[PDB]
Amino acid sequence: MNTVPFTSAPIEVTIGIDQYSFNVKENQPFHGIKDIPIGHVHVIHFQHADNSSMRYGYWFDCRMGNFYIQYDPKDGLYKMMEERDGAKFENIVHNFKERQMMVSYPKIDEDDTWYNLTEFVQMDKIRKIVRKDENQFSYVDSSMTTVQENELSDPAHSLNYTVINFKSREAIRPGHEMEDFLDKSYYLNTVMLQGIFKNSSNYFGELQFAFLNAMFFGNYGSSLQWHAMIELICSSATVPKHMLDKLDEILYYQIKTLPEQYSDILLNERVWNICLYSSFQKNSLHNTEKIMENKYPELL
Amino acid sequence: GAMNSSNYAELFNNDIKLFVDDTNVYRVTVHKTFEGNVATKAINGCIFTLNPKTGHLFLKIIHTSVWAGQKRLSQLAKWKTAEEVSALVRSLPKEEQPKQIIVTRKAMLDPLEVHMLDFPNIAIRPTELRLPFSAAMSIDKLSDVVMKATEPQMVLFNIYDDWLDRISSYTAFSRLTLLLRALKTNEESAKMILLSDPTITIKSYHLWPSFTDEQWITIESQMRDLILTEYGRKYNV
Secondary structure: OEEEEEOOOOOOEEEEEOOEEEEEOOOOOOOEEEEEOOOOOEEEEEEEOOOOOOOEEEEEOHHHOEEEEEEEOOOOEEEEEEEOOHHHHHHHHHHHHHOOOOEEOOOOOOOOHHHHHHOOOOHHHHHHHOOOOOOOOEEEEOOOOEHHHHHOOOHHHOEOOOOOOOOOOOOOOOOOHHHHHHOOHHHHHHHHHHHHHOOHHHHHHHHHHHHHHHHHHOOHHHHHHHHHHHHHHHOOOOOOHHHHHHHHHHHHHHHHHOOHHHHHHHOOHHHHHHHHHHOOOOOOOHHHHHHHHHHOOOOO | OOEOHHHHHHHHOOOOEEEEEOOOOOEEEEEEOOOOOEEEEEEOEEEEEEOOOOOEEEEEEEOHHHHOOOOOHHHHHHHHHHHHHHHHHHHOOHHHOOOEEEEOOHHHHHHHHHHOOOOOOOEEEOEOOOOOHHHHHHOHHHHHHHHHOOOOEEEEEEOOOOHHHOOOHHHHHHHHHHHHHHHHHOHHHHHHHHHOOOOOOOOOOOOOOOOOHHHHHHHHHHHHHHHHHHHHHHHOO
């Protein structure tokens, strides 16, 4: 059970840790988050009380180092940093725990929600989408644009999601125009799975990461990527049976976790109607179709 | 964006452009079977690819053999159209390739865009204009070469005959769209108007009769009258 200590909380802020969140008052004696489950990535995210614009946060894995949060009054945000001195860090955490100035990661024993949302998500893949090689953790915010969005302007602050474009030479074999456009199986299986991602686990990891950035930061480019990766599978007539079964589980937990009040902005009507009712896989996503019909029948 | 009443003069500028109309690509007769079910029988069709500035018509004849053993023919017809338009562009010298292709039906956009991926600088555009190019098969010489075809064939025409010697490409296009709109609304009446005077003939190398400038004014008036009559009938107004 790992800990992310906070130096202090000088500005009033809503702090998120994965799907949980806590309001902290200006100068409230708050010194961090303990009992963080080992074995998963995690995200610690922020929304200032005085500027509900720019949700921002940090993806990290406590197996990779000792991380803490400290407010920077110059850049005006909570920053993640690595403590390289193990003994200084253990002494900081032990003191804050003794003074009970830390919130406990509030996981119910029965509850596999976080595992289910991050099953294929790996820190090493996050660090290739979010390029800042001198840190072991990754900063994401509401405003960061994707490589694909940029093509259509600061490269160092981009989300390097895999570009998916249904009307591209990458997607369409010369001589198989109609076949490849109406059945995206060669784009899914040869170009994306065999070629770029190497396996379904890396594809799902990027799909799950895109969703989580959409949900936690309202990152529009991430929402675009999540839907594109769903549509590429649903629009393929030939998909391995293990992948369809796994996709139904992935999407079920994503739709289950989505705040009810954000379905209007975070869910693309066209993609979901096409995926559940028109696509090759209209009958392959039973769990997802049932939760969508019970939770968001207006969208459909 | 969309070609409309607003940007109509753009058709007659010096940027090469083609209209593509796929209406007549997949053509069928619907009939009863012996068992009293319904079946279709395909007949030869054509792609109508027109340069509105020069009148050059690339009439690609679609022989019924194309459809043999294929499913979802109305879908396939759009992709076959886009394949043949792409092939036509690739066959043209670079300086003759269009800068824009305007499709008369929005359902042609995705098929043509995907077939033209190798030409990122050729703009594929829809139109808000309700153009009467479906009536091309009411032009006897075009109908005749399509029906007689025994294999896939491209036939080249000038749909304006020699009109551009006397009139601009704006005026020529307006005369063509009026003739085709009349043929579309009441074919029999339009054909009667065009052939009524036995002394005005169609040249072997032409599609339309050899009207003088004054006879064209009379003809164009007769076509306008035909169209408005039919309209009052259609709508009881």
